Design an enzyme around this catalytic site. Sequence first.
Site, short mmCIF file in Angstrom:
data_model
loop_
_atom_site.label_atom_id
_atom_site.label_comp_id
_atom_site.label_asym_id
_atom_site.label_seq_id
_atom_site.Cartn_x
_atom_site.Cartn_y
_atom_site.Cartn_z
N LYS B 110 69.52 -9.72 11.15
CA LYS B 110 69.14 -10.32 12.27
C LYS B 110 69.28 -11.79 12.40
CE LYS B 110 67.61 -6.25 15.14
NZ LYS B 110 66.56 -5.73 16.13
C1 LIG Z 1 70.73 -19.29 26.60
C2 LIG Z 1 70.27 -18.32 25.07
C3 LIG Z 1 70.78 -18.47 23.97
C4 LIG Z 1 70.42 -16.72 25.86
C5 LIG Z 1 70.19 -15.11 24.97
C6 LIG Z 1 69.70 -14.14 25.55
C7 LIG Z 1 69.96 -12.76 24.48
C8 LIG Z 1 68.38 -12.35 25.16
C9 LIG Z 1 70.61 -13.14 23.91
C10 LIG Z 1 70.58 -11.40 22.87
C11 LIG Z 1 71.43 -11.21 21.53
C12 LIG Z 1 70.82 -10.08 20.91
C13 LIG Z 1 72.29 -10.44 19.08
C14 LIG Z 1 70.46 -9.28 20.60
C15 LIG Z 1 70.78 -7.88 19.81
O1 LIG Z 1 68.93 -8.03 19.15
P1 LIG Z 1 67.74 -6.75 19.78
O2 LIG Z 1 68.66 -5.43 19.45
O3 LIG Z 1 67.23 -7.06 18.43
O4 LIG Z 1 68.04 -6.21 20.32
P2 LIG Z 1 67.63 -5.12 21.34
O5 LIG Z 1 67.05 -4.04 20.69
O6 LIG Z 1 67.14 -5.61 22.63
O7 LIG Z 1 69.34 -5.04 22.04
#
Ligand SMILES: CC(C)=CCC/C(C)=C/CC/C(C)=C/COP(=O)(O)OP(=O)(O)O
Lengths: 407, 313
Positions: B110
């Site tokens: 990640k």
């Molecule tokens: C301005 C700016 C930089 C904005 C970005 C905002 C933002 C929160 C982007 C998320 C991108 C991402 C790869 C999430 C997956 O992580 P995960 O798998 O840990 O999370 P999840 O299970 O909630 O999808």
Amino acid sequence: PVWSEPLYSLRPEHARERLQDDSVETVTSIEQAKVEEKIQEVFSSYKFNHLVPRLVLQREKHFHYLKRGLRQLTDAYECLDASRPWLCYWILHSLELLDEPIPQIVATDVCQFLELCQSPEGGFGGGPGQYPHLAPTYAAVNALCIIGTEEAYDIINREKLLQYLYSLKQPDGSFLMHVGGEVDVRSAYCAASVASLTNIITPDLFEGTAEWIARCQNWEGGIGGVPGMEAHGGYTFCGLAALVILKRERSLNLKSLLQWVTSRQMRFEGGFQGRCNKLVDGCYSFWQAGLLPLLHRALHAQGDPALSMSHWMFHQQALQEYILMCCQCPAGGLLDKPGKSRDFYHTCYCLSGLSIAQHFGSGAMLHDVVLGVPENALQPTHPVYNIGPDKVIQATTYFLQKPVPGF
Amino acid sequence: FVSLDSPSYVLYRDRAEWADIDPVPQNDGPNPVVQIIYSDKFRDVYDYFRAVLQRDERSERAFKLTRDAIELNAANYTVWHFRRVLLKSLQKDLHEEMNYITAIIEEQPKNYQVWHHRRVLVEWLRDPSQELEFIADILNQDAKNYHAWQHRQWVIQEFKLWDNELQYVDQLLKEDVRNNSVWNQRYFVISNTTGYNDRAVLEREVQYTLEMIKLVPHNESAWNYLKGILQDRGLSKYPNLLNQLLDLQPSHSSPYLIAFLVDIYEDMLENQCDNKEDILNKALELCEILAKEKDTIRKEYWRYIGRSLQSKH
Ligand SMILES: CC(C)=CCC/C(C)=C/CC/C(C)=C/COP(=O)(O)OP(=O)(O)O
Ligand SMILES: CC[C@@]1(c2cccc(Oc3cc([C@](C)(N)c4cncn4C)ccc3C#N)c2)CCCCN(C)C1=O
Ligand SMILES: OC[C@H]1O[C@@](CO)(O[C@H]2O[C@H](CO)[C@@H](O)[C@H](O)[C@H]2O)[C@@H](O)[C@@H]1O
Ligand SMILES: [Zn+2]
């Protein structure tokens, strides 16, 4: 009575909102059930039969946590050594939301530090001497605007900033996050945000950008990092916010987007998930819920006669209940979900989301819904830039008095 | 040579092969803010990294140094950029670097920089032979890793490796039919291969999805996929779907089914359907049911839909 306030999450019918796995277990349902079991325990700890004390935002605890982080940090923050302007932004915005004044000395010190992070080629890096990058550039500009003094405003090298943005612009309308870096919707948002605030937008700077962003909206209705990818709150916020700045919201299917984001609010937890079938998380209180004020404005501009004149199209009370009961660290600071550790990122976005949930504004209409003790009311935040609306107007007014670099 | 945690690791300020160059401390100014109290090992490496960068030294020692800087903070994009400049300048073995990035991603899946670095290498080599299997391993540990899926789509699209992806999608859906990342990949594959215009393909997909829905009635991903593959043409263009869903109404009911019915009715009214008044009344009754009982979390949304329907029809 004023000393008891019934909660949506504590209604007896709320238990019916628990996950129904259809007797078919998969990793997804198991994880979802685990979170729900924990959240129910938390919810129950705020209910004493018919006595339901008003919820309290622990302002002072959060304030002390923030104040400390603005000066020093343990080596536990080595992982963010390339994102220091972000730490400045998250902390300053949180204090701003909490209506806590920033000492003049602290303000000047932040200004000086961000000046050291600014690259001679334009833009800001994650620390002194680091290459510029759109993420910290966005954060630095926002932090400077929150301080809002001419000293802060003038730190930004507008001529080089515009050249830097040009150096990242791709022919298909997309932007690189940094030289030799990757491309995704976050870059378009970071670029549009800093360019509009500092008045350096040219007609060709965002030529093709709106079309590229629209290609990122997928079959789900939300927006993915790049065309073809799964819809996510983080990328969807960036995409719509960027289009609002460019006044090209109509490039998207606003109907499918509206249905998608509203579906991201968890019927049981009350908070928002980042993508379908994943877990609730306090920071999405901003990334997802923040899409509703944006959609409201977009539809309002179109003359939608069915829009509400008092509420955002999501459960404002339920979100406040999730944040206040499940996302506050007793020692100060906020977080993702019960069991997780506090951090400045979640403190910033949980508070930003709480503010959006408390304040509705459209035209001359203002309608507040502050759950709990009245002192819970936070200062409003701009849905596009996520800094105070007053700060946005002040910065744009200031920079509008300067010409676009080299025209 | 030696890792940061190795018992024989030596700080760069103590290495004879580095004595000829002076370290460059980070200047945070006289009155620092968000000042990180770096460990001695962390600061040591970065003081020397700053030295080589400022000197733009394209050397083997600088190359090995970036490896340590990365281990200390794999999110430092500046280090990764310089490492790529060195890979080129020193004409380093790219297959060796691939083995390196493979291990790194496994440890920190990640992280944006590690996946971008890998993409650059695959691009430089024009060699995707290890990609699908490597990605599959990452996904075997976290079936929803966003970066992994993004890299998978890029590789498949850039090198035209569509042949076995639908089969891969079906296997992951068998493992977890609620994996939204897999349903997204399903749309990705079909839309880019046969497309959904082939009515035989569409029928196959609608049948497949309906079966998944009957198996797991409350799995939102399948419902969203069903609407996703039919929405562009218009939900009202599929008359038999309304009846079949209407039959499941009494049993396999759920907010997803009721909401889908409202979506069908909306499109019907938008297409001069017959018995407009009747359709509008049905739609409004369901919006009320959803707002008051079956999907109260979205009460504001459903009330809005009810008002929209009335303003339009
Ligand atoms: C301005 C700016 C930089 C904005 C970005 C905002 C933002 C929160 C982007 C998320 C991108 C991402 C790869 C999430 C997956 O992580 P995960 O798998 O840990 O999370 P999840 O299970 O909630 O999808
Ligand atoms: C936290 C520091 C930062 C960031 C800033 C502002 C918003 C962010 O949103 C994210 C948050 C997460 C994080 C910390 N894993 C998270 C926390 N809660 C939910 N998620 C998904 C991951 C990726 C992103 C992105 N882009 C992420 C700096 C800028 C470079 C991007 N990355 C990788 C980051 O780690
Ligand atoms: O939410 C669907 C909506 O998004 C658009 C782009 O604004 O197209 C996306 O979804 C289609 C499937 O519904 C895909 O074919 C397309 O590639 C994806 O960008 C709109 O056309 C559509 O109405
Ligand atoms: Zn989070």
